[PDB]
Amino acid sequence: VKTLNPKAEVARAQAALAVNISAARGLQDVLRTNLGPKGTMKMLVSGAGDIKLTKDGNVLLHEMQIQHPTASLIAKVATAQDDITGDGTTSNVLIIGELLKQADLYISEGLHPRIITEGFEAAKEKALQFLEQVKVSKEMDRETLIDVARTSLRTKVHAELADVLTEAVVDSILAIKKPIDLFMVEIMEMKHKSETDTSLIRGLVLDARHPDMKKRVEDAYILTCNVSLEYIEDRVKKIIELKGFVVINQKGIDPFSLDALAKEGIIALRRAKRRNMERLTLACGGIALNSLDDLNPDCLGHAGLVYEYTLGEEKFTFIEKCNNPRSVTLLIKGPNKHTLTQIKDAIRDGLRAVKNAIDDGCVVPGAGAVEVAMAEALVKYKPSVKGRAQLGVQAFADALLIIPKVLAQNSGFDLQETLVKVQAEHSESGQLVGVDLNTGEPMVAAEAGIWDNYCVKKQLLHSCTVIATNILLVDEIMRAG
């Protein structure tokens, strides 16, 4: 009686539950050593000479070809933490992992799975609500932005020059805010020189065609166009009539058109990336029509200084000094191209946090300060709900204490020892007490300047508890071979 296909491993009772939780807890163990400002990056070597060295949890869980039908879900959770927010990706992973382990404790004791489910759900209500009662209301000031932007850059490779990058971010976000929009920061990486050369250019930066055309224009009227300029003169005559000194073409130019434009002293470039064409229309405020006879003075960009400097034996056309650069470009110079990839990803997250910071003057005491708090709040919240839930809530509180523990773990200090000191002081000073590894003792986060955005934290518990519990209900899957 073969009711199932051959080689169809099936898990029913505790088996599935246990096997599932373990797989998630394990992965949480592989991503736990990169949390906090002292965490350590990871080098993902995809059997093929490929070496991906990053610290971000998501990226890592996206490169590792996991087979764990459970870990995949975990990889999905971290994905919902990098999109809806950015950093903290790691944190969320450790929460769901450790949490499930806390439940397993209850289950193996006799507690019904679904029953424990409501616990974390009911405790989640309190956990989130508490975040609301601990959120320190900040402003869009530069300092608070430089302090939070830096902390974001830290825990990474550029931690060596986080101070500088942080500056470039606070300026890029302050210049794009009028309702912020990160999609206004053109991240352009370029090798050569050290990472201490990264600058914030307030305009596009390409990578004059004919040697007879001017090479350095003072105030060039960007007359961007798409259609090719080849079959030619009638096309060149219309450009000079529209007062277009610097024509940025998307396609190549005809050899007999480059001499005509070079004659009028017109600076025209050919074969420009489509992304750059859009970044130049939003930065210099110019319109890039199609044909040539259509262009007009109404589609001219107001650049302030368009020169061509070969910073690295590679001629680069810098179209800076824009009237209102709604499209800021954050130039990034790094020693190795690989270093750029990381720095770039770091900024992308660093900028994100800032956006949140200016989109709401709110922030929570990081370094585990919040966790230690919620945990303490839930402990006093369990005797009220009572019932088998009391345990669920308490367990949820203990699970939240994983953040501080791990921190001391990645620092080199005693896990339990630190937890005690931090908890004692916390139950004294307040929501301002956190775990400062840089000192090896419980300090005031709000004082040291260590703060975390609201959205981040909030999203963490949500994506966690929610998905986390679901896995717990899945007592079977049924497969084949």
């Binding site: 009686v1 073969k2 009711t3 199932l4 019904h112 679901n470 049924m478």
Partner: protein
């Protein structure tokens, strides 16, 4: 000798009841957990790395590659039940499985099938008369219809904006109601925005224009709405509704059992077997709550036989409460067909005493 083509398996007599019953019972215990708001959605992983997370018994049976014909007939039971109304897909499956589980036992006592089946088919007729002898007749009437349609949209991805979907289903069904036709309600789903930007488009046949931010979400808003319209299609054919939470099953059970002692004979046991089988609904129900199934069952039939039929299993309180008072009602049609589709299947399934295959 090769009476029949080499490698052609042929179960005979007792060798058939075993492999057939169990296979069906087992498959019924698989999606069993996926019953109630405490459902344990399994993560079906096809033999290719797939990941199917679902609660619906049908969708699950359509993912699990089955080889034994007995378990295949089940996947067919959920195919018919899921097409009619939708929900309760697991109900009809769990019942069909139990009936075989309680039947096999009698087979142990050597109770020839002829007798058993006879009691099963007749018992089936009892439940139908019972269902109607205790159903709560509720009014058309926009108000009522809303409640009915609402309860059919409070468990899916559309529950988010069930209220809106209800008014949409109510209108689409109340308008194409001449017996209402489920083929006169055109559903025009358009990706983009939130399910809140929906509006019924009017007519011997309207043109409901749904909206879905995604592609999977939009099709879901179409199905749930169609189901929300179905219950409305029932209030036009079966304006009867019986309390859920198991209250029904318990009643029919307590009734059937009593009838058993009145019929006596060899079929006196099967009658009870079927009644005790109906107890699985409230049993497995409370189980999804982590409460004592047995204990509950005791107190259940307790206050149930004493104070009307208005009592049912309260999963949120893990105790027995007056369903009627709480406002828990389920269309008699929903229950009506369930018992039917179930018993029937189990019946003819028990008539299968051999299957000519190939290996």
């Amino acid at each position: 000798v090769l009476v029949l083509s080499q490698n052609t398996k042929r179960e005979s007599g007792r060798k058939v009841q075993s492999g057939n019953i169990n296979a069906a019972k087992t498959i019924a215990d698989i999606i069993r957990t996926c019953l109630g708001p405490k459902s344990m959605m399994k993560m079906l992983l096809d033999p290719m790395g797939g990941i199917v997370m679902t609660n619906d018994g049908n969708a699950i049976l359509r993912e699990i590659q089955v080889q034994h014909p007995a378990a295949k007939s089940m996947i067919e039971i959920s195919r018919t039940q899921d097409e009619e109304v939708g929900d309760g897909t697991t109900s009809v499956i769990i019942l069909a499985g139990e009936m075989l589980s309680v039947a096999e036992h009698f087979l142990e006592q050597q109770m020839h099938p002829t007798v058993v089946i006879s009691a099963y088919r007749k018992a089936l007729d009892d439940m139908i008369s019972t269902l109607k002898k205790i159903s709560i007749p509720v009014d058309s009437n926009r108000d009522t219809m809303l409640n009915i349609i609402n309860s059919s949209i409070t468990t899916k991805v559309i529950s988010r904006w069930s209220s809106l979907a209800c008014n949409i289903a109510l209108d689409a069904v109340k308008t194409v109601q001449f017996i209402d036709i489920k083929k006169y309600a055109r559903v025009e789903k358009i990706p983009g925005g939130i399910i809140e930007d929906s509006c019924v488009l009017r007519p011997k046949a309207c043109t409901i224009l749904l909206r879905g931010a995604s592609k999977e979400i939009l099709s879901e808003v179409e199905r749930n709405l169609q189901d929300a319209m179905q219950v409305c299609r029932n209030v036009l054919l079966d304006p009867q509704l019986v309390p859920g939470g198991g209250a029904s099953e318990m009643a029919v059970a307590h009734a059937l059992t009593e009838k058993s002692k009145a019929m006596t004979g060899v079929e006196q046991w099967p009658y009870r077997a079927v009644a005790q089988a109906l107890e699985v609904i409230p049993r497995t129900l409370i189980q999804n709550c982590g409460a004592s199934t047995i204990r509950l069952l005791t107190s259940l039939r307790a206050k149930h036989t004493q104070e009307c039929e208005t009592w049912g299993v309260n999963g949120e309180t893990g105790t027995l409460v007056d369903m009627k008072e709480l406002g828990i009602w389920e269309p008699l049609a929903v229950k009506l067909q369930t018992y039917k589709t179930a018993v029937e299947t189990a019946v003819l399934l028990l008539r299968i005493d051999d299957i000519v295959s190939g290996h």
